[PDB]
Symmetry: C2
């Protein structure tokens, strides 16, 4: 599986192509319209994914017996598995059955859960990028020691900015984030002026320090292990802050990426490297 | 909750109305917030139904059950509460509170499921699937006869519930009869209509059948997906009689024009015969 997670960090998965073009073998969508089909594909795998992560996060809970975990999986999974497998994602289903296979140990289950979560998280990301959220706008309107420095670069925007990430604030989270990335950049479609990208990792570490996003300042950085393994730049568990001096570019980086996921479907990639 | 469940079976919830009128999104549009509300309620519903089914299982403690709830629920509950369904959230919080009997939980779970499944039913009906429509194109001794009718289309048909095929499912659905609910169409599956029946059945479904094998007039149940009643013009339930199968074509036409376009409610009543 991991081979194709890596493949799909660079390339759009073929599954996410047939869905946008309407070439799914089943031709889903009653009365010759795959708009409904596409919608179900996007949402079913997004929520299926959030489920997978939480299943994982309980694989880390030891009060639950692994056998009880496997059973909660055989209960929750098959409906999402089969429908997605019949509406655009055949392999994900088979791999879900591989995850449901008896776990000789708790760690084996945990590893399968996290791999597969990230597989479907990459697919979620790509669908999120190509789903036409635009039809709506036309009609429906209204310790200083531990801070590590890194640099975030948006191409082909050619805009770079710097950021600190407070390892002290969220140690387990920051270490996992530091462990790893050039990934497609997209915009939140309901929250407002924020962008996020699907970081290539599966962190189940608890986050003691979270912030209410209305208190969050500009260029605030946040990682959501739940809605993807997303990294979020606000122009919630907190990760870091883009330095104030460069906050002046984030706003147009925003408008650009909003056009990316709302209007253009033109890829906008974001790289995080550590200074 | 049950108070609200009954009230909603006939009346549009306030929540679905304010979201579909955008009087609860990014850059002054609500269609994304709507797409999210619709899908998250639908899927929180499937999750709740599988969690009740879990609640029947005796291998899992009620404390392990409650912690699997305390983790999978909030991501859906709190979010939906921000966009459309606040009371859904507060009641989810309360379902989580420590239960001392499997039954107490299982009851709150089932009512909450069905509350959410009605919210889903109304969301599916009002949700706009017409937008992409222009952009994206191409023992007989055992069965118990009942009858179905659609108003204001004024069309009826007699059908038989195969108790022999699914005894548990048959009883669970009959005990709700008579009822009259919203009938909507199947937006992805094809030529099938369905309606959200007012029950939450944990009945086994020993017999199931390919929807491609399902004849015209095939009645199937959808306990896994909103405990719905599906007529095809899957767990098996019944069949409309051969001489009445012909009357199903135009009501499917009208109900597709109802769910896809008009939104003018189409109601179906099922009564025992
Ligand atoms: O405060 C908000 O509106 C939501 C914040 C964030 N925004 C995303 C977007 O805007 O696309 C969608 C999304 C978010 N959090 C979630 C939790 C569960 C399921 C979906 C989401
Ligand atoms: O569409 C299909 O081929 C599947 C059959 C059914 N059809 C529904 C429709 O058409 O609205 C959508 C739907 C179905 N089963 C599901 C399971 C999970 C999530 C959604 C669904």
């Amino acid at each position: 599986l991991r081979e194709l997670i890596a493949s799909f960090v660079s390339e759009e998965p073929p599954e996410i192509r047939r869905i946008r073009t309407g070439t799914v073998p089943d031709l889903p969508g009653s009365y010759g319209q795959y708009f409904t089909a596409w919608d179900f594909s996007n949402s079913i795998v997004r929520d299926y994914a959030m489920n997978l992560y939480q299943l994982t996060r309980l694989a880390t809970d030891e009060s639950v017996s692994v056998e009880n975990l496997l059973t909660v999986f055989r209960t929750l999974d098959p409906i999402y598995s089969t429908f997605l497998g019949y509406n655009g994602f055949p392999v994900l289903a088979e791999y879900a059955q591989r995850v449901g296979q008896p776990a000789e140990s708790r760690a084996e289950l945990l590893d399968r859960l996290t791999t597969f979560t990230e597989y479907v998280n990459r697919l979620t990301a790509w669908s999120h990028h190509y789903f036409p959220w635009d039809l709506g706008g036309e009609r429906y309107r209204y310790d200083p020691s531990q801070r590590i420095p890194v640099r975030l670069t948006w191409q082909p925007l050619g805009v770079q900015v710097d950021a600190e990430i407070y390892a002290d604030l969220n140690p387990q989270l920051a270490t996992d984030v530091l462990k790893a990335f050039t990934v497609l950049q997209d915009h939140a479609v309901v929250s407002g002026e924020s962008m996020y990208a699907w970081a290539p990792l599966v962190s189940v570490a608890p986050t003691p320090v979270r912030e209410r996003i209305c208190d969050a300042p500009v260029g605030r950085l946040r990682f959501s292990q739940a809605t993807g393994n997303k990294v979020i730049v606000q122009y919630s568990p907190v990760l870091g802050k883009v330095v104030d001096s460069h906050a002046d570019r984030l706003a147009e980086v925003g408008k650009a990426v909003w056009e990316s996921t709302f209007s253009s479907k033109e890829p906008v990639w974001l790289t995080v490297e550590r200074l």
